[PDB]
Amino acid sequence: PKPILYYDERSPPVRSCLMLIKLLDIDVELRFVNLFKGEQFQKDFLALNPQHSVPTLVHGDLVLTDSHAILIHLAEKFDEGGSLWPQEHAERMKVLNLLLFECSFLFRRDSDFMSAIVRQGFANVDVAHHERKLTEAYIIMERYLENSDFMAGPQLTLADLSIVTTLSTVNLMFPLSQFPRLRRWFTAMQQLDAYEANCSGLEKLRQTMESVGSFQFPS
Amino acid sequence: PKPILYYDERSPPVRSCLMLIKLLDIDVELRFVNLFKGEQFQKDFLALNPQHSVPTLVHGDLVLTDSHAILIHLAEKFDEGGSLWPQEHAERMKVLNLLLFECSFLFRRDSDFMSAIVRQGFANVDVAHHERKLTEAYIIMERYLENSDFMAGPQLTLADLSIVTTLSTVNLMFPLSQFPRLRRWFTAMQQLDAYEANCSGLEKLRQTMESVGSFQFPSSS
Ligand SMILES: N[C@@H](CCC(=O)N[C@@H](CS)C(=O)NCC(=O)O)C(=O)O
Ligand SMILES: N[C@@H](CCC(=O)N[C@@H](CS)C(=O)NCC(=O)O)C(=O)O
Numbered sequence: 001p002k003p004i005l006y007y008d009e010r011s012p013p014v015r016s017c018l019m020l021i022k023l024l025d026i027d028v029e030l031r032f033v034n035l036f037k038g039e040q041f042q043k044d045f046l047a048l049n050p051q052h053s054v055p056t057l058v059h060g061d062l063v064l065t066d067s068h069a070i071l072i073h074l075a076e077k078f079d080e081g082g083s084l085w086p087q088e089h090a091e092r093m094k095v096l097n098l099l100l101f102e103c104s105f106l107f108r109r110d111s112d113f114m115s116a117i118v119r120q121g122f123a124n125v126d127v128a129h130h131e132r133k134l135t136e137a138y139i140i141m142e143r144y145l146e147n148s149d150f151m152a153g154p155q156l157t158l159a160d161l162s163i164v165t166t167l168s169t170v171n172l173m174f175p176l177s178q179f180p181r182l183r184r185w186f187t188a189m190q191q192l193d194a195y196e197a198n199c200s201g202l203e204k205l206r207q208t209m210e211s212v213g214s215f216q217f218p219s
Numbered sequence: 220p221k222p223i224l225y226y227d228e229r230s231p232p233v234r235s236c237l238m239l240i241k242l243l244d245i246d247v248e249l250r251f252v253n254l255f256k257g258e259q260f261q262k263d264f265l266a267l268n269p270q271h272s273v274p275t276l277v278h279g280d281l282v283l284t285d286s287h288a289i290l291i292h293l294a295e296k297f298d299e300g301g302s303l304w305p306q307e308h309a310e311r312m313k314v315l316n317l318l319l320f321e322c323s324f325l326f327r328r329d330s331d332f333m334s335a336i337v338r339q340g341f342a343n344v345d346v347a348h349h350e351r352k353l354t355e356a357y358i359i360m361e362r363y364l365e366n367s368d369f370m371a372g373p374q375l376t377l378a379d380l381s382i383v384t385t386l387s388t389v390n391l392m393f394p395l396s397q398f399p400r401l402r403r404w405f406t407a408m409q410q411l412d413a414y415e416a417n418c419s420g421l422e423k424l425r426q427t428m429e430s431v432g433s434f435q436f437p438s439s440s
C-alpha cells in the first residue's frame with residue numbers, strides 16, 4: 001500500500017521528507033504527531049518507533065525511523081533512474097556523505113542550540129558558544145559549495161533537501177552575511193516549488209519557539 | 220589506486236571501518252591521525268576534510284568523511300553479493316536505518332557523555348543524566364534484537380559493525396548485564412575474528428581517557 005508518514009512539520013528532518021514528497025508528487029498518508037504535546041511518547045507510536053522521533057515512515061512492512069533513510073527509500077521507489085539519488089556509485093556516495101554531514105554535524109549542532117533555548121530560556125543561552133559551533137557548519141558548507149553548484153554535485157540531490165531545512169532553521173538565529181556561496185545556494189533552493197513544503201513548518205516552529213520562550217528571533 | 224584510511228583507532232567509528240576491512244580482507248593504506256595531538260586540524264587534512272574527523276577515506280577522487288558512508292562504500296566495492304550490505308531493497312533499508320540510529324542516537328549520546336568527561340572532569344559530570352540517556356539506547360537496541368540474532372536481521376550486517384564499536388565504548392562505563400538479548404549479542408560479536416580490530420583501539424581509548432582525566436572506569440581492573 002501507499003507510504004505512511006508520521007510527522008510534525010516543525011521538525012526540519014520532517015520538512016526534508018515533505019519537500020521530496022512534493023517534488024516527486026508522491027501519494028502519502030500523513031499522520032500528525034504533535035511534538036509540543038509530547039505525542040511521540042504515546043504508547044502506540046513508541047511501539048512503532050522506540051526512538052520516539054519524527055519523521056517515521058511506514059511502507060508496507062518497512063518501518064523507517066530516520067529522515068535520511070526515508071529520503072533514500074522514497075527516491076529509490078518513486079524516482080528510479082532519477083538524479084536525486086544518483087545511479088553512478090561515486091556520485092551516490094557523495095550524496096550519502098553529505099546526508100551524514102547533516103545528521104552528524106549540522107542537525108546535531110542546531111539541535112544543541114535550539115534545545116538550549118527551551119531548557120535554559122533564550123536570554124540565558126550561551127549564544128557565543130552556539131554561534132561558534134553553527135558558524136563552523138556554515139564555513140564547511142561554504143567550502144563544499146566552492147567546488148559544486150549544489151551540495152553534493154552539479155545537480156540537486158537528496159543532500160540539498162536534507163540540508164536546506166535545517167539550514168533555514170539555523171538561519172532563524174544566525175545570518176548568512178559572510179557566506180556568499182551559501183546565500184546563493186539558499187536563494188536558489190527557495191526558488192524551487194518544493195521549498196513551499198518547508199515554509200509552513202518553519203514559521204510554525206518560529207511561532208511555537210517564540211511563544212514558549214516569550215522571546216523573538218532576530219529579524 | 221588502493222583506498223587510504225585516515226584513522227585513530229581510539230575512535231569508535233574508525234574501529235567499525237577497521238572491522239569491515241578485516242572481515243573483507245581489503246588492502247588499505249592506513250594513515251594515523253593523532254587526535255590527542257589535534258592532528259585532525261593539520262592544514263592538509265583539514266583541506267581534505269573540513270569536518271576534521273576520522274575515519275576519512277580517500278579512494279581515487281572520492282573522499283568520504285563519515286564512517287557509515289565508508290562502510291557502505293567498501294561493502295559495495297568489495298562485497299557485492301554479500302549479506303553485510305544486502306542487495307534486497309527492504310533488507311538494505313533496514314540496515315541503513317540502523318546505521319543512522321548509531322549516528323543520530325547511540326554515538327551522539329556516547330559522544331555527549333565522553334566529551335563531558337574531558338570538558339568538565341570525570342568527578343563533575345552529571346553521571347545520572349548520561350546514564351539515563353545511554354540506558355535508553357540499550358533499551359532500544361534490546362528491542363531491535365527481539366526478533367533476530369543480529370541488529371538488522373538473521374545475518375551480520377554493517378549495522379552490527381557500526382553499533383558494536385560505540386556499544387563497547389559505552390560499556391566502559393555502563394554494564395549490559397540487565398539486557399539479555401544485548402548481552403548475548405555483544406558476547407557473540409566479541410567471538411568474531413574481526414572484533415580484534417576493536418580490541419586494541421578500545422583499550423587505547425580507555426587508557427587515554429583514564430590518564431587524561433585521572434580516573435578509572437568502573438569496568439577497569
Ligand atoms: N536523525 C533523525 C533526527 C530525528 C529527530 O531528532 N526528530 C525530532 C524532531 S526535529 C523529534 O522527533 N524529537 C522528539 C523526541 O526526540 O522525543 C532524522 O533525521 O530523522
Ligand atoms: N559521524 C561521524 C563521527 C566522526 C567523529 O566524530 N570522529 C571523532 C573521533 S570519535 C573525531 O574525529 N573528532 C575530531 C574532531 O571533531 O575534532 C562518523 O561516523 O564518522
Ligand SMILES: Nc1ccc(N2CCc3sccc3C2)nc1
Pocket residue numbers: 010011012035036037118205208209212
Ligand atoms: N526537534 C524538535 C523540533 C521541534 C519540536 N517542537 C516544536 C518546537 C517546540 S518548543 C518545545 C517543544 C517543542 C516541540 N521539538 C523537537
Ligand SMILES: Nc1ccc(N2CCc3sccc3C2)nc1
Pocket residue numbers: 012110111112114115118169
Ligand atoms: N525538550 C525539547 C523541546 C524542543 C527541542 N528543540 C526545539 C526545536 C528544535 S528545531 C531543531 C531541533 C530542536 C530541538 N529540544 C528539546
Ligand SMILES: Nc1ccc(N2CCc3sccc3C2)nc1
Pocket residue numbers: 229230231254255256337424427428431
Ligand atoms: N571522538 C574522539 C575520540 C577519541 C579522542 N581522543 C582519544 C581520547 C582523548 S581524551 C582527550 C583527547 C582525546 C583524543 N578524541 C575524540
Ligand SMILES: Nc1ccc(N2CCc3sccc3C2)nc1
Pocket residue numbers: 231329330331333334335337388
Ligand atoms: N575535546 C574533546 C576530546 C575528546 C572527546 N571525546 C573523548 C573520546 C570519545 S569516545 C566517543 C566520543 C568521544 C569524544 N571529546 C571532546
